[PDB]
Amino acid sequence: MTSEATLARFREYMVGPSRFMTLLSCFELGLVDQIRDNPGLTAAELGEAIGAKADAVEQLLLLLVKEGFVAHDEASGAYVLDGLADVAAGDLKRALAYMNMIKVVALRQLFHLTESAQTGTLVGLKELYGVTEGTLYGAVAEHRDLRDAWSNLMNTVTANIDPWFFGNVDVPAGARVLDLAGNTGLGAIHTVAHKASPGLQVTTFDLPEKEQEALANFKAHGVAESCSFIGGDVFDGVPKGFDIVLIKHFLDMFDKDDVIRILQGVNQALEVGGQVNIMVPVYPEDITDTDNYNVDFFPAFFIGCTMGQGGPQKLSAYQSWLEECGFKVTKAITKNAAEVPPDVIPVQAIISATKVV
């Protein structure tokens, strides 16, 4: 790879921040809605509609014309949607929810990635919110803006991927299922929806503060009889007396040492023949693969923004760590990136394993 190709790629990297917010601000300002709802307005007409100078509107829309999202008639000054014309409202809501989460959880916090990587602490959250200890997950109880941006997304990501998950995981009649780090219970609710059987019991395990929201989630989905909540810290111990443990979007938050503690805990909580089903973003075996954006996002996201440690691993590393912790792998499935909508960053693997210890 050339020195001049390297310097060219640096420039692509340098315009990342300005590109990201130019596009998001065009949605936040209401410009895209105005252009969709009223085809053929000028910068002056759009400016009056959204409460901004026409000259500001003109400049910010230039990048959307360059990318072919929006078209501009040179003669009239008129704007219409181009690329964005045929994007379904559902697809755009998904993408904007992820972009909003990055803006709130990552954009400003990333300034302090270096200091975060040096201390193994979240300097971003320290500087912005005055949080001195722990993770984003510990702080969202106290910080409404952080909780809504992160929670709404995680729940959209989970609603979209879990049909695939439950289609590839075995939950037999009358199973006792633990959803480890199950947040406000959507994972447990999905278990009941897809695996409804007589005697089926599902429990959400997460931070004690999630309890009231979890119980209300169960009530709202009509599954309060078959779903329950245990509050705690995974590092204090995994609840005992389950047949099957689900671990969805959790192991990638942690370095090996803590992943090993989680899986050793999960082992102690299971009988021989008890099962664990893991869904986690994985790096590909060949890191140069362009169909997988996990490495372009998560290292900086976990180290600088949410944890102060962690990041995904190759499916082979997770398979190895399960084997070190007294489990035998029965399933390993990587999601086809071309079968996921092209706006979605995470590429997940499913790993199923049986305790043999």
Ligand X SMILES: Nc1ncnc2c1ncn2[C@@H]1O[C@H](CSCC[C@H](N)C(=O)O)[C@@H](O)[C@H]1O
Residues 124-143 that bind ligand X (CB under 6 A): 135, 137
Token pair for residue 100?
């909003």
CA gap 213, 186 in Å, rounded: 10
Backbone angles phi, psi at 131, to 5 degrees: -85, 125
Q: Which does 59 bind (CB under 5 to 8 A by kind): ligand X, its own copies, none?
A: its own copies
Among residues 116, 158, 226, 348, the one that binds ligand X under rule CB under 6 A? 158
Task: Pick one of its own copies, ligand X, none as the site partner of residue 209 (Cβ within 5 to 8 A by kind).
Answer: none
Known binder of ligand: residue 233? Answer: yes
AA letter at 155: N
- Taking the complex as a whole, how short is the minimal distance between the CB of residue 147 and ligand X, in angstroms? 10
Q: What are the φ and ψ backbone dihedral angles of 55, each rounded to 5 degrees? A: -70, -40
Only segment of 8-16, 169-177, 231-239, 295-303 that touches ligand X (CB under 6 A): 231-239
Say which entry of ligand X, its own copies, none residue 73 contacts (CB below 5 to 8 A, set by partner kind): none
Residues 168, 174, 179, 180, CA torsion sign = negative
User: Measured between alpha carbons, how far is 227 from 229 in angstroms, rounded to an integer?
Assistant: 7
- Least distance in Å: CB of 146 to its own copies? 14
Contact between 84 and 70 (Cβ < 8 Å): yes
Q: Which of 128, 207, 317, 329 binds ligand X (CB under 6 A)?
A: 207
Q: Which of 94, 112, 248, 355 binds ligand X (CB under 6 A)?
A: 248
Please check whether residue 215 is in contact with residue 186, taking contact to mean a CB–CB distance below 8 angstroms. Answer: no
Identify the residue whose tokens are 């999202």.
69
Tell me if 166 contacts ligand X by CB under 6 A: no
Q: Which is nearer to its own copies, 84 or 325 (CB)?
A: 84
Please give the Cα distance from 243 to 169 (Å, whole number). 13
Q: Which is nearer to its own copies, 150 or 229 (CB)?
A: 150
Other C-beta atoms closer than 10 Å to the C-beta of 98 total 17
- DSSP string spanning 140-185? TTT-HHHHHHHHHHHHHHHHHHHHHHHTTS---TT-EEEEET-TTT
Taking the complex as a whole, the smallest distance from the CB of residue 312 to its own copies amounts, in Å, to 9
Residues listed for the chain: 357
Q: Which is nearer to its own copies, 53 or 240 (CB)?
A: 53
Phi, psi of 197 (to 5 degrees): -145, 150
Instruction: Rule CB under 6 A: say whether 281 interacts with ligand X.
Output: no
Q: State the CB neighbour count (10 A cutoff) for residue 316.
A: 12
- The amino acid sitting at 151 is S
3-state DSSP assignment of residue 274: coil
Q: Give me the least distance between CB of 210 and its own copies, in Å please.
A: 27
- For residue 154, state whether it binds ligand X (rule: CB under 6 A): yes
Q: Is residue 56 part of the contact set for ligand X (CB under 6 A)?
A: no
Query: Which among its own copies, ligand X, none contacts residue 90 (Cβ within 5 to 8 A by kind)?
Result: none
Q: Is there binding between residue 345 and ligand X (CB under 6 A)? A: no
**Encoding tokens for residue 110?**
């990333």
State the Cα–Cα distance between residues 79 and 32, nearest whole angstrom: 10
Least separation in angstroms between residue 252's CB and ligand X is 9
**Between 195 and 248, CB nearer to ligand X:** 248
Retrieve residue 337's tokens. 């990136």
φ and ψ at 319, to 5 degrees? -55, -50
Among 249, 301, 305, 308, binds ligand X (CB under 6 A): 249
Residue choice 47, 124, 185, 187 for contact with ligand X (CB under 6 A)? 187
Q: Among residues 47, 124, 182, 346, which is the contact residue for ligand X, using CB under 6 A?
A: 182
Question: Structure tokens of 217?
Answer: 């989630």
Q: Is 255 annotated as a binding residue?
A: no
Residue 230 binds ligand X (CB under 6 A): no
Could you tell me the smallest distance in angstroms from the CB atom of residue 341 to its own copies? 6
Residues within the annotated binding site?
158, 206, 210, 233-234
Residues within the annotated binding site for S-adenosyl-L-homocysteine?
158, 206, 210, 233-234
The residue ranges that bind ligand X (CB under 6 A) are 135, 137, 154, 158, 181-183, 187, 206-207, 233-235, 248-250
